Design a protein around this ligand. Structure first.
Ligand SMILES: [Ca+2]
Lengths: 27, 112, 27, 27
């Protein structure tokens, strides 16, 4: 027989890293 | 899939094309608008299947509910939330989907 | 006759969600 | 003979991108 259907999409990627700290506040 | 309006005391609302998979890149809006004094309960029924992620709450597709300043959600996944007592007579339901995936969507009945 | 071989592997999974916003700035 | 069975799932998606900067810090 012929090869089967392609497989399903893989699992989702992981959550990204956190973003950088915000800019400083009033002095 | 916007401007869906429901004005009877009871009714049924679904994601587009339910019970078949919903379309990609959907931003749908539904409005339940009743007379003052009515208080709407939302109760999901049948299969509930909104794309989710195992680590993060609803980052791809979701349903949100708003009444006045009240907000419920986002909701997603394979199990619907518990019935929602909105305590309100005019409700907006928002449904967003992203550009991939095959999920069935959602169906709810409302009543007041 | 006999069934064919497994289909090819499916497409990669979708991109992970973006990372959370960074923490507030220093004082 | 009959078609083979579906292939294996694809690879896991890519790590999500970094988050955005935090909000401004305190005064
Ligand atoms: Ca999706």
């Amino acid at each position: 027989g012929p090869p089967g259907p392609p497989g399903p999409p893989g699992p989702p990627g992981k959550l990204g890293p956190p973003g950088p700290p915000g800019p400083p506040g009033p002095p | 899939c916007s401007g869906n309006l429901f004005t009877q005391r009871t009714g049924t609302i679904t994601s587009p094309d339910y019970p078949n998979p919903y379309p990609k890149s959907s931003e749908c809006s539904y409005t339940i608008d009743l007379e003052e004094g009515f208080m709407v309960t939302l109760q999901f029924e049948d299969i509930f299947d909104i794309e989710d992620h195992p680590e993060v709450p609803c980052p791809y597709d979701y349903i949100k509910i708003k009444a006045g300043s009240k907000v419920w959600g986002p909701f997603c996944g394979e199990k619907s939330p518990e019935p929602i007592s909105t305590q309100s007579h005019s409700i907006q339901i928002l449904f967003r989907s992203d550009n991939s995936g095959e999920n069935r969507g959602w169906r709810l009945s409302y009543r007041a």
